[PDB]
Scaffold this active site. Sequence first.
Site, short mmCIF file in Angstrom:
data_model
loop_
_atom_site.label_atom_id
_atom_site.label_comp_id
_atom_site.label_asym_id
_atom_site.label_seq_id
_atom_site.Cartn_x
_atom_site.Cartn_y
_atom_site.Cartn_z
N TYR A 1 -1.68 -0.76 10.37
CA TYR A 1 -1.62 -0.88 8.92
C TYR A 1 -0.25 -0.46 8.38
O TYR A 1 0.32 -1.13 7.52
CB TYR A 1 -2.71 -0.01 8.29
CG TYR A 1 -3.01 -0.33 6.85
CD1 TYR A 1 -3.77 -1.45 6.51
CD2 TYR A 1 -2.58 0.51 5.82
CE1 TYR A 1 -4.09 -1.73 5.18
CE2 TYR A 1 -2.89 0.24 4.49
CZ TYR A 1 -3.66 -0.88 4.18
OH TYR A 1 -4.00 -1.15 2.87
N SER B 1 0.86 -1.18 0.00
CA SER B 1 0.00 0.00 0.00
C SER B 1 0.90 1.22 0.00
O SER B 1 2.09 1.11 0.25
CB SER B 1 -0.86 0.02 1.27
OG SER B 1 -1.35 1.32 1.55
N1 LIG Z 1 -4.73 2.75 -0.09
C1 LIG Z 1 -4.56 1.55 0.37
O1 LIG Z 1 -3.85 1.29 1.38
C2 LIG Z 1 -5.25 0.44 -0.29
C3 LIG Z 1 -6.47 0.63 -1.19
C4 LIG Z 1 -7.10 -0.64 -1.71
C5 LIG Z 1 -6.58 -1.89 -1.36
N2 LIG Z 1 -5.45 -2.04 -0.54
C6 LIG Z 1 -4.95 -3.40 -0.20
O2 LIG Z 1 -5.39 -4.28 -1.22
C7 LIG Z 1 -5.77 -5.56 -0.67
C8 LIG Z 1 -7.21 -5.82 -1.13
O3 LIG Z 1 -8.07 -4.97 -0.40
P1 LIG Z 1 -9.51 -4.53 -1.06
O4 LIG Z 1 -9.46 -3.07 -1.39
O5 LIG Z 1 -9.86 -5.48 -2.19
O6 LIG Z 1 -10.51 -4.68 0.19
P2 LIG Z 1 -11.71 -5.71 0.32
O7 LIG Z 1 -12.14 -5.68 1.75
O8 LIG Z 1 -12.77 -5.39 -0.70
O9 LIG Z 1 -11.13 -7.18 -0.07
C9 LIG Z 1 -10.28 -7.81 0.86
C10 LIG Z 1 -10.69 -9.27 0.92
O10 LIG Z 1 -9.80 -9.91 1.86
C11 LIG Z 1 -10.59 -10.80 2.65
N3 LIG Z 1 -9.95 -11.03 3.96
C12 LIG Z 1 -9.78 -10.18 5.00
N4 LIG Z 1 -9.20 -10.82 6.08
C13 LIG Z 1 -8.98 -12.05 5.69
C14 LIG Z 1 -8.42 -13.24 6.31
N5 LIG Z 1 -8.05 -13.26 7.55
N6 LIG Z 1 -8.30 -14.37 5.50
C15 LIG Z 1 -8.68 -14.41 4.25
N7 LIG Z 1 -9.28 -13.36 3.58
C16 LIG Z 1 -9.40 -12.28 4.29
C17 LIG Z 1 -11.92 -10.09 2.81
O11 LIG Z 1 -12.97 -10.99 3.21
C18 LIG Z 1 -12.14 -9.46 1.43
O12 LIG Z 1 -12.88 -10.34 0.56
C19 LIG Z 1 -5.64 -5.47 0.86
O13 LIG Z 1 -4.40 -6.06 1.29
C20 LIG Z 1 -5.58 -3.96 1.08
O14 LIG Z 1 -4.90 -3.62 2.30
C21 LIG Z 1 -4.78 -0.97 0.00
#
Ligand SMILES: NC(=O)c1ccc[n+]([C@@H]2O[C@H](COP(=O)([O-])OP(=O)(O)OC[C@H]3O[C@@H](n4cnc5c(N)ncnc54)[C@H](O)[C@@H]3O)[C@@H](O)[C@H]2O)c1
Lengths: 258, 258, 258, 258
Positions: C156, C143
């Site tokens: 985070y 991120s």
């Molecule tokens: N600006 C930022 O920091 C930023 C923006 C978007 C995404 N991200 C990163 O991208 C990745 C995807 O996030 P996203 O935006 O798709 O969010 P999201 O919540 O839509 O998807 C994340 C998925 O991970 C799953 N999850 C969470 N904890 C879990 C666990 N213990 N075991 C298995 N699955 C688990 C959730 O159920 C969800 O389906 C994450 O690592 C997130 O931190 C970072």
Amino acid sequence: RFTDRVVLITGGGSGLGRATAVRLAAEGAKLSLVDVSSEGLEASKAAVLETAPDAEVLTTVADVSDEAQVEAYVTATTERFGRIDGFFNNAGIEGKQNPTESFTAAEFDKVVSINLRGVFLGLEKVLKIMREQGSGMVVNTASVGGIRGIGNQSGYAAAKHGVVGLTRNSAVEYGRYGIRINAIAPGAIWTPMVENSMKQLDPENPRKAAEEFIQVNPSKRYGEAPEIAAVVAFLLSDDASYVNATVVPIDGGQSAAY
Amino acid sequence: RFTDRVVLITGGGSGLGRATAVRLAAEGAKLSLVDVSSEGLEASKAAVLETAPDAEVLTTVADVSDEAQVEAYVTATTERFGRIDGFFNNAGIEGKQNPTESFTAAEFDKVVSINLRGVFLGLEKVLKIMREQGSGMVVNTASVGGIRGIGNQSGYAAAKHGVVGLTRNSAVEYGRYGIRINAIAPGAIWTPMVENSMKQLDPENPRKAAEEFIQVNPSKRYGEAPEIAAVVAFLLSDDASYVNATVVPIDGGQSAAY
Amino acid sequence: RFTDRVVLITGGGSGLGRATAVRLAAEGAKLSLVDVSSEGLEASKAAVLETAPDAEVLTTVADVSDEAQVEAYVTATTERFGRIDGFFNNAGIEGKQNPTESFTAAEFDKVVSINLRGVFLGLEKVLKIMREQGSGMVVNTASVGGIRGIGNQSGYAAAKHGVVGLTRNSAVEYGRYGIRINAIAPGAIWTPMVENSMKQLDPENPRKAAEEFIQVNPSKRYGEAPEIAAVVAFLLSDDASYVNATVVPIDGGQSAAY
Amino acid sequence: RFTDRVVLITGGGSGLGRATAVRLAAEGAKLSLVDVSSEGLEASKAAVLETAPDAEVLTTVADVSDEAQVEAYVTATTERFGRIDGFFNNAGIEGKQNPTESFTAAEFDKVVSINLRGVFLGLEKVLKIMREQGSGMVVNTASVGGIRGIGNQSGYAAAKHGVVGLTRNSAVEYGRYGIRINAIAPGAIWTPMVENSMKQLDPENPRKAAEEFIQVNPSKRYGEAPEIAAVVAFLLSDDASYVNATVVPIDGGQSAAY
Ligand SMILES: NC(=O)c1ccc[n+]([C@@H]2O[C@H](COP(=O)([O-])OP(=O)(O)OC[C@H]3O[C@@H](n4cnc5c(N)ncnc54)[C@H](O)[C@@H]3O)[C@@H](O)[C@H]2O)c1
Ligand SMILES: NC(=O)c1ccc[n+]([C@@H]2O[C@H](COP(=O)([O-])OP(=O)(O)OC[C@H]3O[C@@H](n4cnc5c(N)ncnc54)[C@H](O)[C@@H]3O)[C@@H](O)[C@H]2O)c1
Ligand SMILES: NC(=O)c1ccc[n+]([C@@H]2O[C@H](COP(=O)([O-])OP(=O)(O)OC[C@H]3O[C@@H](n4cnc5c(N)ncnc54)[C@H](O)[C@@H]3O)[C@@H](O)[C@H]2O)c1
Ligand SMILES: NC(=O)c1ccc[n+]([C@@H]2O[C@H](COP(=O)([O-])OP(=O)(O)OC[C@H]3O[C@@H](n4cnc5c(N)ncnc54)[C@H](O)[C@@H]3O)[C@@H](O)[C@H]2O)c1
């Protein structure tokens, strides 16, 4: 930490160069100040003597973009003091603000000649002397604009990033002799250059421009010249004996902030 | 620069912690040393008293991975000195070397609990006190392994990169109070941890390992503990008043070299 | 670029994971999706089949913070497909926002267990398989908070910076086998995580919070999930055959801006 | 991804420029190749046509250090194709190897005029056209020497770091229009420039020099031109729609390694 040590400072007739001269003098240093302005040099020497009455200060008028004049200020320094222990490669200008498509080649060439070429020339001449000495500390003045993108400053951004490059490349070459070469990346420090920069940003209301610019800074304030001088004093002293090829931002934390 | 200033140091019973304690005491500081080793704490205090006979040194045995013990050393410090002006969040371990597929969850969790969680807990408790004071300087010990990939150290790499993250995030939050939070990234410094690291690298010939590891370094030599202490003293003093959220490598220039 | 290639995706039941699954399936990939949400996994598979009717998609419910469940999804993947060509180590949570002194150890531990330990465990099991194959591509989701300080997110920031560390350390170890390990650093991408993040920022007006957060971004807009999927597809393909140990920000340019 | 899209490439008569032309032509692009070598351009166009016989390829002889010739190649491109969708600002030279004190002002000025000024002039003319279009993708060729210190290359290090500076500054300025500006940082790629570089390192045994140089690389091998072309194709396509102001190392992982 600077008793009897000789420090050469370019751009020593104002702002960061002057503040650094004063701090180093307080620590016992012998100084050689270089600038295109004899008026500025006179004021910096006076400022130094107010803090350290017995300080030995040499002043030389020279244009860092001219190789012959660079050799001239180096020769003047060695003939007076016999050696060069510290070098604050600091002279520089901002350049007229404009988006890339309107910056102009003439202005780009002007900023590069002083800010980048000048730094290169200083290193080329001073590092030879330091290698022969088997010792020496160097600090090149970059900018946060040398590690991040500020906008509307093609020449400055290119030149200051270039200074970081010279710092890293030279540091790798000369570290084996005990010489250390590092760069500082000052942010919003209230100096003549920054005051004029805000004048460019908003000619009708430079105060408003200045206040608006600093709002996002984590420290919520502008830095002062002595705060930069304190870091440069550290980097030119024995305390930085194992610090090499680094870039130290002095910006209240903004370059690290998203 | 530290006359009557209170500095809390974790991992103060050996290496960098001990060297920093000595340097700060030489500059007039009052000290609160924390470590899991009572014997190491005793030796550090004796070392401090040899350089500064009149120094006030408090020692406290505590495991930084235990929140209850972290609160205990912070409380012991404030009950004794009434304030905390500087904090060197330095305690840490290396972890058993192994490629990622064989590093093990047990070892990963161990290194993270001490090197990362320990640093977080320290910040959580100390930053509250500093905010209330309206002042404070903090230095978190990262590593070149916190900004680059060394190999065979999943746990250490993750934890130390994490320390840099805590540094940047916390610095953005507390800079507005005048508080400064920075990190040092030491490289090849000869301390007990590095000595043991070379033993892991080649149990059969640890000296050969140490020699081979440093061959590529721009400075061509290992750094010494006092060289780290000098940088930490700078970062915990007023000289670093506008330096925030930065990572300062102290590695002879290797992290900047290609 | 993915005909017959098997790609394993954690966090495949939503946002970036789902978008990547769709993009990869459009390129001919066989998929193994892993998530704690059964509802999400089935909606993702449905989305995949709309774009690629003949796509082979396996879904497995697993909590990445539990080593036994990590081994379970890896085994489920190899039993069904017999190999793992790409791995998008993506699962993660944000964590409750709070300044460092109020973040709490419980929340810190929670975020670290999923965002950091989960990524480590996945690498430990998958890299062994890829080494034995003599090939493999890995993308760990970091991120902008893994390379910069955002504020109010100790957990985070530590975990995501830690992910970058795992990426650099593991890449140095396995690059010799032809394996590539890189990380992406997404910024303001509109996904369910960011939607909830803005809710945390301003519960009474999350819409206003989102609007104000993006004002400073150079691109002047939020990114969309398919824009991340495109970069991940690049990094998991043969087009990234000489890209290793890098962090690729996908943030409209904000991390590079001062 | 490039059907009927117009891509302008400087340094298109050899190495990375030629490989990128071939890859883009395979994806349907229309090309405008610029170089000082007419023979090189002829060979590059022939190579393109062998892969894509239906490709439209324009060639123009021009020296990027001359503003009049830069305006000439941009005008030639718009009169032939009516627009510029992609721009690979790639022309460059290495410069004679030498430590800083022996590099010479002449050689420094030569490398800067081509590698840095040439890139600035290209951006100045092309970004105006892209802004008017409301779209455009740009990739500037930096180097690992643009983000790290290699040694013995003052001119190259300064110029390539400068290219990163222009990339960041311009990206912050033009991102609002949907335009994306990024840089690539190639490492040891076997091209004519690198082959010549090894000859400089050891004129007597260039093969030994090359073998020795790559030993420390995590990937244990040199990269090939098509591997760079694949990354540039990504960065000039819609797949990089939210990637801006970044520097993408293509070096097997060495810049991330300690
Ligand atoms: N600006 C930022 O920091 C930023 C923006 C978007 C995404 N991200 C990163 O991208 C990745 C995807 O996030 P996203 O935006 O798709 O969010 P999201 O919540 O839509 O998807 C994340 C998925 O991970 C799953 N999850 C969470 N904890 C879990 C666990 N213990 N075991 C298995 N699955 C688990 C959730 O159920 C969800 O389906 C994450 O690592 C997130 O931190 C970072
Ligand atoms: N945020 C930032 O980018 C930032 C903020 C402060 C300072 N700086 C840098 O710090 C350095 C000093 O800046 P300052 O704030 O003290 O500005 P300043 O104008 O107060 O001082 C600069 C001095 O350099 C001299 N000088 C200019 N061109 C010269 C030449 N050709 N030869 C010799 N001397 C010359 C000037 O006459 C002046 O005395 C500069 O390199 C500047 O770019 C950067
Ligand atoms: N290249 C490198 O990575 C590098 C080199 C030197 C030091 N460092 C870092 O500097 C710091 C100090 O290292 P050092 O060289 O002085 O090592 P050291 O082993 O000499 O001293 C570390 C001290 O921390 C203490 N300690 C360990 N776990 C603890 C716990 N749970 N609670 C409280 N105290 C605990 C030890 O007892 C010891 O006194 C460490 O964080 C280390 O990771 C990094
Ligand atoms: N590790 C590294 O630093 C590394 C490795 C490979 C390439 N590169 C960079 O990639 C780019 C391409 O290099 P390459 O490997 O293909 O080398 P190359 O010599 O094969 O091709 C470079 C082309 O640029 C042309 N050129 C040189 N000066 C010019 C000028 N003034 N005007 C117009 N054209 C000019 C040359 O004639 C040649 O055709 C260069 O910018 C180079 O610095 C860097």
